[PDB]
Design a protein around this ligand. Structure first.
Ligand SMILES: CCCCCCCCCCCCCCCCCC(=O)OC[C@H](CO[C@@H]1O[C@H](CO[C@H]2O[C@H](CO)[C@H](O)[C@H](O)[C@H]2O)[C@H](O)[C@H](O)[C@H]1O)OC(=O)CCCCCCCCCCCCCCCCC
Ligand code: CLA
Ligand code: CLA
Ligand code: CLA
Ligand SMILES: C=Cc1c(C)c2cc3nc(c4c5[nH]c(cc6nc(cc1[nH]2)C(C)=C6CC)c(C)c5C(=O)[C@@H]4C(=O)OC)[C@@H](CCC(=O)OC/C=C(\C)CCC[C@H](C)CCC[C@H](C)CCCC(C)C)[C@@H]3C
Ligand SMILES: CCCCCCCCCCCCCCCCCC(=O)OC[C@H](CO[C@@H]1O[C@H](CO)[C@H](O)[C@H](O)[C@H]1O)OC(=O)CCCCCCCCCCCCCCCCC
Ligand SMILES: CCCCCCCCCCCCCCCC(=O)OC[C@H](CO[C@@H]1O[C@H](CS(=O)(=O)O)[C@@H](O)[C@H](O)[C@H]1O)OC(=O)CCCCCCCCCCCCCCC
Ligand SMILES: CCCCCCCCCCCCCCCC(=O)OC[C@H](COP(=O)(O)OC[C@@H](O)CO)OC(=O)CCCCCCCCCCCCCCC
Ligand SMILES: CC1=C(/C=C/C(C)=C/C=C/C(C)=C/C=C/C=C(C)/C=C/C=C(C)/C=C/C2=C(C)CCCC2(C)C)C(C)(C)CCC1
Ligand SMILES: CC1=C(/C=C/C(C)=C/C=C/C(C)=C/C=C/C=C(C)/C=C/C=C(C)/C=C/C2=C(C)CCCC2(C)C)C(C)(C)CCC1
Ligand SMILES: CCCCCCCCCCCCO[C@@H]1O[C@H](CO)[C@@H](O[C@H]2O[C@H](CO)[C@@H](O)[C@H](O)[C@H]2O)[C@H](O)[C@H]1O
Ligand SMILES: CCCCCCCS[C@@H]1O[C@H](CO)[C@@H](O)[C@H](O)[C@H]1O
Ligand SMILES: CCCCCCCS[C@@H]1O[C@H](CO)[C@@H](O)[C@H](O)[C@H]1O
Ligand SMILES: [Ca+2]
Ligand SMILES: [Cl-]
Ligand SMILES: [Cl-]
Ligand SMILES: [Mg+2]
Lengths: 38, 34, 38, 30, 64, 172, 34, 36, 342, 33, 81, 504
């Protein structure tokens, strides 16, 4: 409701970890399935 | 085509959910600008 | 004679007119509602 | 002919360097 | 300034510097001609491009 | 080589033997020099756009600045006000010190990576190899733009130093 | 105090809404086998 | 009958050096293509 | 007169987080569609029917190898309108035929016009001189000469650059093998402007940061600056002496310095654009006739110029069959140029 | 080498004509007060 | 400032996260299903791994005519048995 | 003082000396056209319009005189091969002379207008200041342009009072200057219909007459006058430059793709006629018709005109040149002397083989021979040690039909390979390479050079439009921004509307 409740450093940390998860999934895909040369 | 409905359905439910949580202030924003 | 491509030309003309028309319709509307204070 | 041309142009540039450094307009503070 | 016979003849043609028509004047009519011209350029461009193909219009040297 | 066409020769053979275009350090190098050139024209145009009127129209505006003068010669607040509206306010610098630091750092760091690209391809750690990376259900190779680059690289490889190799692999 | 639906709101969502949809589509692609 | 629109023209020394450098370097660049 | 035009003008020019303006009516849809088309195509759309290539994440390509590829060579220079006679309103066929390429290139072209009108529009409202718009003519000259004029001179859109990382690398290598583009003096001037621009960027930034006045007490010097202060934040006098003694010459005029920083990369990009206009017609700087006459008659005459042509010849023969599939090149092994062993 | 012999006069006028332009302008600037 | 609510204000507000803890995953899942149902292949006309070639052919189905290109692609698509 | 890049600004407020400068420019351009035409006449060889036409000889202005009806010389020849003709005064020489005389008259006029610059006509009658009423000048000049445009189309191009224009058949074999009737239907917008050229000038001329009368009689709206700065002559420069680069792009395009106003007998073939084997298909159709009508192979090919075979040769493709390969095409492959005839290759089995032609992209190209189904049957190998398709292995021979080698057959591998190397260029010609000391390297034609110069100039004039447009709309800040610029005009929120102080 009122902006201020959730501290920004926690928002940044959670958003950062989501980025790392999704980019890691993409690098995982380079070695499996389509485009893996196998 | 059922796959069209399977894909749009999660988006449609998201539109309706945001409307429920925002319509009091949305009507209040539209009223102020009048 | 109205060839298929001449028909297609008219459809492209009507489509662009519609897109420009709605765009300026909406813009003129909103500009009349939210005026600047002088 | 063409060798003389290339070397002549090059030599003019090196001469230009000399004048641009030692016979420049002095910067003057105000 | 120096006057000349030809200068006196042409004097009226250079005498209305700065004279305007009030407001928007003929701007709306100008806009209509611009729109028609745009459609015209689109037609001749797309004929040349073979995006608009018309009966009896063969865009080729073979039309002599 | 110490020459203009000799430089091109070095570059073409480098591409054949290391696929430098597919190496991220060369790509960071290109970002460095493309970006450096962009920010050069950017900074130049913004300062030039906000020079304070000190001259008439018949004279060069450069005479409006005097070597050693105490006061700044352009209005950084007007430059920031222009550029902040071009993008948005927080994408624009109003601190000349950090602006000029950014101008220093972007090309310098990029060119460091370029130099490190050459220096590490010197030990044969080469650009990305996606030759035949995409394969269909049966196992047919599906070409990508990477495989087209490979065809060009092969043509460079087989022709360079045409009399110098006796054995099938060019290992240095 | 502040409005909710502004030009900035529209600009933000025309970019962010397709982005998330595309990220889910590309995530799914990582599990496709030939 | 003196024309009032006349103006003096200037080229300072730094501009001369810059201009001569541009011309010589352009000649050094294009000469090879002129001889071909 | 406060009619609807003036009221619309008021609203378009409101000071908001994202300025809109009249230019925004052109800029925002065209920029958004060009970007959305590139993301859509690189994520989902193939190049199988135009190039024989996979080119999307859907097919297994990665960020370096995805592209929106040019249309098939048989399309000529067709606008490839979605409603045109090739796709005939069929969105799926349109994608398979290369319609997204003209879509991105044309909306991009008009987006760039719109961005430059935005630079003019904002400059006129804020009261600054429009040199930022003028400098932006250089990116526009590059885009128009490479993505529009060049293929318009050639046989079709197919030979324009495709919108992708590795596709652009192929474009660089094609230009070496077929056009000997490194040899072209208009490219050389472009290289000088781009590298000279990067040089000026680094050296100006570093000079300022190392001739700063001590205007505060902290070891972080960024804080000791105020946007409205009247004084220069660094010493032009000390900067001038340092460079005069290190390098022989130095800037003494800060206005000239910053105009020069505009001039160098902008002029360089404009020169490179002119050369690409030449290449549209194959009007190349491919050879030195005097070198070829000597080398034809004297089999001991060898230079780096003749060495590089042999490389170009390899590029052409080894890449043409795959890179130009509509030509149906069949080059038996025995005709391929190759040195010893390799 | 069989160079294009017009290359000589082309290069010479390319240097001379613009360089002379600049020298005229410069010298008449110094001679002003 | 230009009058809009600060971003840092919005994204630390409980109401923002009540709304977007739903709308963000919903869009992600919609994108996932666009691929997993196979709908993306058919919208854009992109081959599946088993539909680049017919079983024994090794030639590309390359478009070679301007005004019959649409029919050429349809013919190539039929020939996949 | 003035920097060197501004010296010509002294004319902005001086209409009489502006006219003088514009007169001097016109004198220079007219003198260039006269002296270029005299140079071309002194070097042009008129003796072979078939294999040595003007476009092989580097002729640039000669085709523009011919396009509008000047085809003859006072010395008795015409460009279509006729002798003993009398062109009257309007020969190539009479046109050149007229431009020279015009140049000198304009030079004298420029001196008069430079000296007598202070004419009362250039002063505003109310204020006494120099002033040009540009909106009415525009209507006057547009009205004159419309009359001239109309008269060009109605009298010159139709032949009503004038010669017409160059027209030809689709293969550029029988071109001449002909009266042309207007085409008033939709095919008048076909670029290859000369009738549309006539109709355009009549119709656009009338529209320009009408629009000219409008712009003489109706003043500009105050809102357009202010927004476009119609009291500032530099606004006209900005929009005139824009019109000019628009026109330059159009003439570059129609020169490259071809149109009724860029005929191939005047400027050479287009690159696209090689890409699509345009001439090769017409040649084959004619040979089929002869063979079908009972003639032998030697009669079918001998009936092919040398002029048509010459078009089917990549040396006349304007996309085969180089930026610094200077001079006429004749300086490259030579002065064409004769068609050698059509080469037919056969292997030892008697199968007919076809040389793969050179695409324009390639400076060099391998020699590869296929059968009718595109299967490789012979080539010139690079590595010999695993060659299977060599001419020696496959017994390749060549026979010629038509042309000077008609009826001959060659079987020795070196001679056969020699003709196969030439066959990648299309039809094979004998060239004189000695007369001009030709170097054997392809050059582009006037079509190529025209297109290149005009696309480059169009792009550069785009920068001119941007620059002068910016000077028009930002004249008030040309020397710098206001030293008293309030930080509030440029900081966010102080005004509701950007730059509008009444919206605090
Ligand atoms: C500066 C800032 C600007 C900011 C950006 C502005 C963005 C605006 C976007 C405009 C897009 C223009 C698209 C032009 C498409 C085109 O040209 O399409 C090309 C068509 C011509 O079509 C081509 O024609 C060729 C020749 O055919 C001819 O010859 C053939 C072979 O003999 C056959 O006879 C055939 O029937 C006959 O038509 C081939 O057929 C090609 O396949 C076919 O594509 O021209 C045409 O539509 C019209 C041609 C006339 C107008 C050209 C002016 C504009 C272009 C200038 C560029 C100069 C290029 C020269 C090289 C340098
Ligand atoms: C607003 C800015 C803008 C601009 C400048 C463009 C420009 C373009 N679009 Mg894009 N587009 C836009 C917004 C824009 N678009 C939006 C918002 C969408 C989403 C709907 C699209 C979706 C889109 C698609 C799917 C395609 C394009 C295409 C194009 C290109 C061809 C357009 C054309 O021929 O229309 C011609 C129409 C006009 C010029 C309209 C003018 C109307 C005149 C002035 C008034 C008179 C008309 C009259 C009233 C009607 C008479 C009809 C009657 C005779 C039957 C051109 C580059 C095509 C393309 O890129 O090809 C590859 C294409 O396929 N656009
Ligand atoms: C639109 C202009 C134009 C065009 C298309 C032509 C076309 C032609 N001319 Mg003509 N000519 C022209 C104008 C033109 N001319 C003018 C103005 C003159 C008087 C000088 C001439 C005088 C002339 C003569 C005497 C001859 C020709 C000939 C020819 C033919 C061969 C051209 C050639 O080899 O060029 C080669 C072109 C180049 C080498 C291009 C030069 C590129 C320049 C140098 C780049 C400069 C870059 C610059 C320095 C960089 C600035 C950078 C800075 C801004 C940072 C060709 C048909 C020849 C012919 O065959 O006659 C029968 C011939 O003998 N012309
Ligand atoms: C119809 C065309 C036209 C006319 C009547 C003008 C007129 C003017 N220009 Mg503009 N301009 C034009 C086209 C034109 N320009 C084009 C195409 C461009 C882009 C290249 C420009 C870019 C431009 C800039 C950047 C500037 C001007 C400026 C000016 C003003 C002063 C010029 C001067 O004193 O130069 C004097 C020039 C010299 C003493 C030597 C120039 C030598 C050139 C570079 C090489 C030689 C060319 C050759 C002789 C002729 C070839 C002709 C070509 C068409 C084939 C003057 C009002 C200046 C201004 O605004 O002042 C306030 C200014 O800064 N113009
Ligand atoms: C590849 C190199 C390169 C890139 C990527 C680039 C990018 C940019 N330059 C800009 C500006 C500038 N660049 C300038 C000088 C230079 N710029 C240079 C080189 C580049 N400049 C160089 C070398 C110079 C020196 C002369 C100046 C002076 C400016 C600016 O003032 C302006 C800026 O504000 O910078 C801070 C911005 C304009 C934004 C815009 O138009 O939005 C609108 C977006 C539109 C209209 C969409 C364009 C669509 C494009 C044209 C086609 C499609 C592209 C696909 C979406 C992606 C394809 C990707 C593959 C190729 C891999 C943008 C950040
Ligand atoms: C006043 C100044 C006068 C001199 C100024 C300085 C001269 C510099 C030389 C510039 C041209 C150099 C020509 C090449 C060398 C040479 O000798 O050529 C020599 C050629 C002449 O070609 C000769 O012709 C002979 C038969 O007539 C023989 O065949 C010779 O072998 C052949 O060399 O010169 C030309 O014909 C060029 C004339 C002009 C053509 C311009 C066409 C394209 C113009 C577009 C340019 C736009 C670029 C703008 C970019 C910004
Ligand atoms: C696919 C092709 C489609 C063709 C084109 C069709 C769409 C038109 C394209 C342009 C659409 C732009 C819409 C954005 C405008 C907006 O969101 O304003 C939101 C406005 C004003 O919000 C207000 O926000 C204002 C600030 S600001 O203007 O948003 O910055 C504030 O002043 C005010 O108090 C507050 O109430 O509120 C509305 O209700 C708009 C009514 C729409 C009818
Ligand atoms: C700290 C890690 C830095 C590693 C690389 C070095 C970057 C800075 C050096 C550039 C030199 C330019 C010429 C001198 C220019 C010059 O004179 O600088 C001056 C500038 C200001 O100097 P000050 O004296 O104010 O501060 C420096 C010290 O005195 C301590 O206060 O220095 C800095 O800003 C230091 C910044 C350090 C922190 C920067 C971290 C950057 C990391 C960003 C991540 C990049 C990864 C990209 C991956 C693609
Ligand atoms: C085309 C078209 C169209 C349109 C469409 C659109 C408009 C779309 C959009 C789309 C979109 C809009 C999309 C997006 C996407 C996005 C994405 C996909 C992203 C991703 C990202 C990432 C992946 C990131 C990464 C990173 C980086 C980069 C750096 C930092 C870090 C990180 C790692 C995070 C229409 C319909 C009109 C019509 C038809 C055609
Ligand atoms: C006086 C007189 C007369 C005479 C006259 C005359 C004799 C004239 C002549 C004239 C002339 C005889 C002229 C000429 C002119 C020329 C020109 C004007 C040229 C120019 C050129 C240019 C401009 C070029 C440029 C360039 C170059 C150089 C390089 C490449 C690029 C370019 C193209 C840029 C008479 C008796 C009639 C009578 C009256 C009096
Ligand atoms: C072969 C290539 C040749 C290229 C040719 C180049 C021609 C260039 C001509 C430049 C002419 C400069 O023109 C010259 O301008 C100067 C000022 O600048 C004028 O000088 C005038 O102003 C100065 C300045 O205070 C006064 O002191 C002086 O008494 C007055 O006459 C000259 O009267 C005029 O002769
Ligand atoms: C294209 C737009 C041209 C402006 S048109 C102009 O618009 C006014 C609104 O201010 C009206 O009052 C007026 O009647 C109308 O002619
Ligand atoms: C082995 C040389 C004789 C075999 C016939 C060669 C092909 S033909 C030959 O080609 C020359 C260009 O190379 C022309 O200049 C010449 O006119 C022509 O006869
Ligand atoms: Ca499987
Ligand atoms: Cl090598
Ligand atoms: Cl070895
Ligand atoms: Mg995978």
């Amino acid at each position: 409701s009122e902006g201020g409740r959730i501290p920004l450093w926690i928002v940044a940390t959670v958003a950062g970890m989501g980025v790392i998860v999704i980019v890691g999934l993409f690098f995982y895909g380079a070695y499996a399935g389509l485009g893996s040369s196998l | 085509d059922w796959r069209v409905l399977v894909v749009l359905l999660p988006v449609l439910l998201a539109a309706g959910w945001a409307v429920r949580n925002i319509l009091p202030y949305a009507v209040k924003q539209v009223q102020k600008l009048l | 004679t109205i060839t298929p491509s001449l028909k297609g030309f008219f459809i492209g003309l009507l489509s662009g007119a519609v897109v420009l028309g709605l765009t300026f319709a909406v813009l003129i509307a909103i500009s009349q509602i939210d005026k600047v204070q002088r | 002919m063409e060798t003389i041309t290339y070397v002549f142009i090059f030599a003019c540039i090196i001469a230009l360097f000399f004048f641009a450094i030692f016979f420049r307009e002095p910067p003057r503070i105000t | 300034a120096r006057r000349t016979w030809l200068g006196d003849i042409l004097r009226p043609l250079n005498s209305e510097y700065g004279k305007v028509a009030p407001g928007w004047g003929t701007t709306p009519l100008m806009a209509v001609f611009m729109g028609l011209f745009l459609v015209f350029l689109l037609i001749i461009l797309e004929i040349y491009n073979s995006t608009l193909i018309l009966d009896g219009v063969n865009v080729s040297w073979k039309a002599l | 080589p110490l020459g203009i066409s000799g430089t091109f020769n070095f570059m073409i053979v480098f591409q054949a033997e290391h696929n430098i275009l597919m190496h991220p350090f060369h790509q960071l190098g290109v970002a460095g020099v493309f970006g450096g050139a962009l920010f050069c024209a950017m900074h130049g145009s913004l300062v030039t756009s906000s020079l304070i009127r000190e001259t008439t129209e018949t004279e060069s505006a450069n005479y409006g600045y005097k070597f050693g003068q105490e006061e700044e010669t352009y209005n950084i607040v007007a430059a920031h006000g222009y550029f902040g509206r071009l993008i948005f306010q927080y994408a624009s610098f109003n601190n000349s010190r950090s602006l000029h630091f950014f101008l220093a750092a972007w090309p310098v760091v990029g060119v460091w990576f370029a130099a490190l690209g050459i220096s590490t391809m010197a030990f044969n750690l080469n650009g990305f190899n996606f030759n035949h990376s995409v394969i269909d259900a049966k196992g047919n190779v599906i070409n990508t733009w990477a495989d087209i680059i490979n065809r060009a690289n092969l043509g460079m490889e087989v022709m360079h130093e045409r009399n110098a190799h006796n054995f099938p692999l060019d290992l240095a | 105090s502040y409005p909710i639906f502004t030009v900035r709101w529209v600009a933000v969502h025309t970019l962010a809404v397709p982005t998330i949809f595309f990220l889910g589509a590309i995530a799914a692609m990582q599990f496709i086998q030939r | 009958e003196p024309n009032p629109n006349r103006q003096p023209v200037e080229l300072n020394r730094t501009s001369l050096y810059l201009g001569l450098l541009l011309i010589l370097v352009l000649a050094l660049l294009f000469s090879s293509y002129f001889f071909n | 007169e406060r009619g609807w035009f003036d009221i619309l003008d008021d609203w378009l020019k409101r000071d908001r987080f994202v300025f809109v303006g009249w230019s925004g009516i052109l800029l925002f849809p065209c920029a958004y569609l060009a970007l959305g088309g590139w993301l859509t195509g690189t994520t989902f759309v193939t190049s199988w029917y135009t190039h024989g290539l996979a080119s999307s994440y859907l097919e297994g390509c990665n960020f370096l190898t995805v592209a929106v590829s040019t249309p098939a060579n048989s399309m000529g220079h067709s606008l490839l309108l979605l409603w045109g006679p090739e796709a005939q309103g069929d969105f799926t066929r349109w994608c398979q035929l290369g319609g997204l390429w003209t879509f991105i290139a044309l909306h991009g072209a008009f987006g760039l016009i719109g961005f430059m009108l935005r630079q003019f529009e904002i400059a006129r409202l804020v009261g600054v001189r429009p040199y930022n718009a003028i400098a932006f003519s250089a990116p526009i000259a590059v885009f128009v000469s490479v993505f529009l004029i060049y293929p318009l001179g050639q046989s079709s859109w197919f030979f324009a650059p495709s919108f992708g990382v590795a596709a652009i690398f192929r474009f660089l290598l094609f230009f070496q093998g077929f056009h000997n583009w490194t040899l072209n003096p208009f490219h050389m001037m472009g290289v000088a402007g781009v590298l000279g621009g990067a040089l000026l960027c680094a050296i100006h930034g570093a000079t300022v940061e190392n001739t700063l006045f001590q205007d505060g007490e902290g070891a972080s010097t960024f804080r000791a600056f105020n946007p409205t202060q009247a004084e220069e934040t660094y010493s032009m006098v000390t900067a001038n002496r340092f460079w005069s003694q290190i390098f022989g010459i130095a800037f003494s005029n800060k206005r000239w310095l910053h105009f020069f920083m505009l001039f160098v990369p902008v002029t360089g990009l404009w020169m490179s654009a002119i050369g690409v206009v030449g290449l549209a017609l194959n009007l190349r700087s491919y050879d030195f006739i005097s070198q070829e006459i000597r080398a034809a008659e004297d089999p001991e005459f060898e230079t780096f110029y003749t060495k590089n042509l042999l490389l170009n010849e390899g590029i052409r023969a080894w890449m043409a069959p795959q890179d130009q599939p509509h030509e149906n090149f069949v080059f038996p092994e025995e005709v391929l140029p190759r040195g010893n062993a390799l | 080498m069989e160079v294009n012999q017009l290359g000589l006069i082309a290069t010479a006028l390319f240097v001379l004509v613009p360089s002379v332009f600049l020298i005229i302008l410069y010298v008449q600037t110094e001679s002003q007060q | 400032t230009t009058g809009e609510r600060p971003f840092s204000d919005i994204i630390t507000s409980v109401r923002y996260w009540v709304i977007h803890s739903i709308t963000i995953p919903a869009l992600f899942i919609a994108g996932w299903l666009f691929v997993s149902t196979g709908l993306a292949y058919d919208v854009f006309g992109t081959p599946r791994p088993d539909s680049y070639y017919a079983q024994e052919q090794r030639s590309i189905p390359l478009v070679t005519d301007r005004f019959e290109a649409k029919q050429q692609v349809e013919t190539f698509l039929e020939q996949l048995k | 003082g003035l920097p060197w890049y501004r010296v010509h600004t002294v004319l902005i407020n001086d209409p009489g000396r502006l006219i003088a400068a514009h007169l001097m420019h016109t004198a220079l351009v007219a003198g260039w056209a006269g002296s270029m035409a005299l140079y071309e006449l002194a070097t042009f060889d008129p003796s072979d319009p078939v294999l040595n036409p003007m476009w092989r000889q580097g002729m640039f202005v000669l085709p523009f005189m011919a396009r509008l009806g000047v085809t003859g010389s006072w010395s008795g020849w015409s460009i279509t091969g006729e002798t003993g003709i009398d062109p009257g005064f309007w020969s190539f020489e009479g046109v050149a002379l007229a431009h020279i005389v015009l140049s000198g008259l304009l030079f004298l006029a420029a001196c008069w207008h430079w000296v007598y610059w202070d004419l009362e006509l250039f002063r505003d009658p109310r204020t006494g200041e120099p002033a040009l009423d540009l909106p009415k000048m525009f209507g006057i000049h547009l009205f004159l342009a419309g009359l001239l445009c109309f008269g060009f189309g109605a009298f010159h191009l139709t032949g009503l009072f004038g010669p017409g224009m160059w027209v030809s058949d689709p293969y550029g074999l029988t071109g001449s200057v002909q009266p042309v009737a207007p085409e008033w239907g939709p095919d008048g917008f076909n670029p290859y219909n000369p009738g549309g050229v006539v109709a355009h000038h009549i119709a656009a001329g009338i529209v320009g007459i009408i629009a000219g009368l409008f712009h003489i009689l109706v003043r500009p709206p105050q809102r357009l006058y202010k927004a476009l700065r119609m009291g500032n002559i530099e606004t006209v420069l900005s929009s005139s430059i824009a019109a000019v680069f628009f026109a330059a792009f159009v003439v570059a395009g129609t020169m490259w793709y071809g149109s009724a106003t860029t005929p191939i007998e005047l400027f050479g073939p287009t690159r696209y006629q090689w890409d699509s084997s345009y001439f090769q298909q017409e040649i084959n159709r004619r040979v089929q018709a002869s063979l079908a009508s009972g003639a032998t192979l030697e009669e079918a090919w001998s009936a092919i005109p040398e002029k048509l075979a010459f078009y089917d040769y990549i040396g006349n493709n304007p996309a085969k040149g180089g930026l610094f390969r200077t001079g006429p095409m004749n300086k490259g492959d030579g002065i064409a002397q004769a068609w050698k005839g059509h080469a037919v290759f056969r292997n030892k089995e008697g199968e007919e083989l076809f040389v793969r032609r050179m695409p324009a992209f390639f400076e060099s190209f391998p020699v590869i021979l296929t059968d009718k189904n595109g299967v490789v049957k012979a080539d010139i190998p690079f590595r010999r040690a695993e060659s299977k398709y060599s001419f020696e292995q496959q017994g390749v021979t060549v026979s010629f039909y038509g042309g000077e080698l008609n009826g001959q057959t060659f079987t020795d591998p070196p001679t056969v390979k020699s003709y196969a190397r030439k066959a990648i260029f299309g039809e094979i010609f004998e060239f004189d390479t000695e007369t001009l000391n030709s170097d054997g390297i392809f050059r582009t034609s006037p079509r190529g050079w025209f297109t290149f110069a005009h696309a480059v100039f169009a792009l550069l004039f785009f920068f001119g439009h941007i620059w002068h447009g910016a000077r028009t709309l930002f004249r008030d800040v040309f020397s710098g921004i206001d030293p008293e610029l309030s930080p509030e005009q440029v900081e966010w929120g102080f005004y509701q509307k950007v730059g509008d102080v009444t919206t605090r």
